[PDB]
């Protein structure tokens, strides 16, 4: 039947590099990672079929979420202050593994979202004295590039001029 | 090549390449060295696995035979997952028989255990034949439909090979 | 027939032949056959119904016969379907 | 390593300062709190990637809600009248705390939404003679700034001239 | 009359890709709808107040393929990311209808071929949730230019051509 | 007081005439059939009531659907090719009936959507190797007129002279 | 009349292969062995009869049980670890026999559930300090295939070519 | 091979508690099932219509302890009511398997330990009926976060944590 | 402690199975503990390779595969120490 069991949705570990600060906090959720192409319609004049032309690549906004816990004060301050420095940007590290419990077995490098700008920092998703859900700290990021370097798989090799 | 001589050639744009994968056997079933290597891999995997079973007490239950069958199944399963056999399922890949129903107590007293295995080794592509037709302008789809129907029917009901072999 | 072309080849590699006319045999079910009762001087199959693949096979086996025109018409109209 | 527990959704207490009045009524609900960045798009000309430029910070509207109880007439009038004075502002105090019944453990200071203007006052969310839900006082506020001063964590230090 | 042949099921298709000059052996477990859509214009004949529809500007809508994200998909990620960088390179989609029970595909007829497709979106990870249990979903959006079929006897798609 | 149990949603049989081809495949589903009137607002000047003026009759698009089964390649090719010929049209025949099982008892004529143009052909609604639903052939049509000619009961009679 | 006398519910021996190591333990209880077809509805258009279309085969979850006894520690510690390795699988072996006591009389091959994942492991069904039932080790497996290999009877054979 | 050692009975397990920094001396006469659950997702390899199950998102289900409500349980009640108020406080459950005929438990092996448990429910009195004759039962529901064992020569719940 | 879990960090043994009645009569209780203390970073070694233009990705793939395989096989330490 099957050999290598596919990655689950829980099979990734997410870390942040906020400017010159390396954060040890781990995020529980992350939105989808894409490379979208904006499209224009054209024709070759020889037919009435609408042809699609790629262009203007964009890496869409990524929303990280975690449980709001003490010790996140510094994370909140760093995320709030990062955009104030034009040199500073946020890096996202996503390492794929096969976690049983605390028994991650990572293989391959890690997908790195490089040169991200903060678009939203929500320490508290809501408040309800009758609510029971854990308060969620959310952060929206706009990445500029994706790569991968810290392992033996390299699952985001972008095209390059290979002489 | 049909006589079992594997040639090495200096091909332009490729370099020095071996252009033969045949053995010295006259048996049509072991023509290719790949089949020999697959059978050897199966046999040696099983032998190395059973080396740990050698010199083990055969208790009252004779559970060691069932354990050996289990181990054979897992070993050959991994060989199927590696891809040494032909088919779409392990059932078409291999089969094992090593229970106590094939063990004679007279031989067990001497320390002999018999295990029977069947496998379907993977084959290879040796020579590739292109049979291409040159149609007139306009009748491509009709000619394709007719010829494809004929070929598929012949292969499906086994009359494809029925016919002389050219030269 | 379009499948054995590479059988009598020893060297490995990709080879090209022309796609010939491939015969499509018939599945055995009632009223897929026609029995022509005729006469040929050479009694090859005297009173023995013999399958015929085409007019060429009919001529080769039985040679001259007044039923040759009927055989040709049958094969032309059947277009490879049905048995004679 | 499950040590200090994370804050729960019920782990905050909300209070209001309406103009010169220190309102003592506690609010049961509040919406999300962020620092939103408006964005523009640009390119460096050397590539065809769309880059995002932050700008025009905004703190989105915050909707507080509570159960409509007697003694809320004072709060209704205060919230209805605060905007009439250009000097008057509404301040929102959010104290996180590890709540267990009426027991709490406040740690760190309190988030303070400073200089908030009232955008909506709804004493009665709806009326239904057959309904059974508690009537809800709602108040929408537009904050201008966020700080933190009450305690020993101060987790909203905006960048300043250090 | 009476159902002699059971109809195709939603699971009765096998999907394969040709990315540029690469023949990917990976199979996709999900695909969106396959259409030939006509863009319509409204007109009148002048003798009535009925609105008549006029077809034109054919378009084959975007097709979204999806599968389970497993190791060995790094080559697929890189190829899909890089295909649009070559103006000569296209993506071809092969859909073989069949009547599979388990691993016992029964393919009858040819294969529907989405020819000259351009990548519009590549999503190796549909979502990350450290508490989730769903399988990570590789997604890929393609814009095809034409549809045909060549393989087995049954020609499923034949565009009108000179007789 | 009810005598004849009314027509059910399952009480219709749908057939297609694609160009010069009389297609014998029956369709399992169809969308709503109407004669819609576009409207303009006006006033008579003597009051402030908005009055509605009908105009620009339209017959909204009709979506036929069926189970995708072998033998549908002819239907796919015909529906893909019909719009290529400006003389070619698609006709939809809907026969109401009261079928128990295979025991349809038609009563009345058959409603005919005449001069229909294909707007969408979807042989496969979706693909999923874990799905169990039957693959659905869909076809969207834009009719120009509606009539009925067969059995006694005429269903659709537009106002003639 | 009746001759071969049919199988009893106790007429099977259940064994496990957990990853690369062979378990010598036996299981005294196993749930139903099934091949389920998820069904779809459709119509031919010639009638209002509802037809069912098979598809999306699945082999439902199988719950094995045995008596929790010393020596099951390795069984536990390995059923915990199977899923951690994406290469590891659980294989279930069911041998039909005609035992009187310890005198099993196997006939035919052994049905094999191949490529099973652990969904649940319950060493202790419950604790009752004045209870008298035997502690019940349970384990739930999601199989991916079924076959039959080790005998003169093919108890299960999936459709294949030829 | 044969039955040399009798299996554990349902009464062969002693239950103890640790409530924050309190080592509770009372014993519990009933504990519910002890489990490790794998939340499962569905997927396909694309080569077949067989549904494959993917484990993930481990969770140890709720455990309900019960005992006879007796004097001296007031401190136990007051501790269980207060555990959750302290974010540092945790409930630890200790289950020692033994082979007790009367009060002659024969402990063999270590003790299973449910670590980092939160109180979800505390029922001092299951019910009241002046006609009833059953013993009043004090119940407590615990959500555990981990399982291990460290108390003896036999370790029952070794995680594959050890890389 | 070093370890993702307590079952990696520490272990205890102080039940009655390790107590001797003769010692208990004297007032002695024996406890046995095992712990894995955390370590520290003392010297950090940078092994950096200089790559020609273009071949960086291939060199990285090869070297990373070799290094990871060596580490997971435990062959990384099997050698002679250079000064």
Author numbering:
A (entry chain S): 2 to 164
B (entry chain A): 339 to 505
C (entry chain F): 2 to 85
D (entry chain T), G (entry chain Y): 2 to 163
E (entry chain X), H (entry chain Z): 1 to 163
F (entry chain W): 2 to 162
I (entry chain B): 423 to 505
Sentences from the study reporting this entry:
A-1(L) is a Myoviridae cyanophage isolated in 1970s9 that specifically infects the model cyanobacterium Anabaena sp. PCC 7120. Using cryo-electron microscopy (cryo-EM), we solved the structure of A-1(L) tail machine, which consists of three parts: a 205-Å-long neck, a 1045-Å-long contractile tail with a complicated baseplate, and six pairs of tail fibers. The dodecameric gp2 portal, the pentadecameric gp5 and the hexameric gp7 sequentially constitute the neck of A-1(L), to which five neck fibers are attached. The long and contractile tail of A-1(L) contains 24 rings of gp10 hexamers that form the tube, surrounded by the sheath of 24 helically stacked gp9 hexamers.
Besides the baseplate, the 1045-Å-long tail of A-1(L) is composed of one tube initiator/hexameric gp18, one sheath initiator/hexameric gp30, the tube and sheath that consist of helically stacked 24 rings of hexameric gp10 and gp9 in two layers, respectively, surrounding the tape measure protein (TMP) gp13, in addition to one terminator/hexameric gp8, from the distal to proximal of the neck. Encircling the TMP, the tube forms a six-start helix structure with a helical rise of 36.2 Å and a twist of 36.2°. Each tube subunit adopts a conserved structure, containing a β-barrel domain and an α helix, in addition to a β-hairpin that protrudes towards the next ring to mediate the inter-ring interaction, thus extending the tube. Notably, stacking of two rings of the tube is also maintained by the complementary electrostatic potential. Moreover, the sheath also displays a six-start helix structure similar to the tube, with each subunit possessing three globular domains in addition to two folded termini, N-tail and C-tail. The domain II (residues Ala364-Ser460) of one sheath subunit stabilizes the N-tail (residues Met1-Ile27) of one subunit and the C-tail (residues Thr461-Val505) of adjacent subunit in the succeeding ring, enabling the extension of sheath. Meanwhile, the helix α10 of sheath domain II lies on the concave surface of tube β-barrel domain, further stabilizing the interface between the tube and sheath. However, TMP was proposed to adopt a six-fold helical bundle structure in Myoviridae cyanophage Pam3, which is consistent with our observation for the majority of A-1(L) TMP.
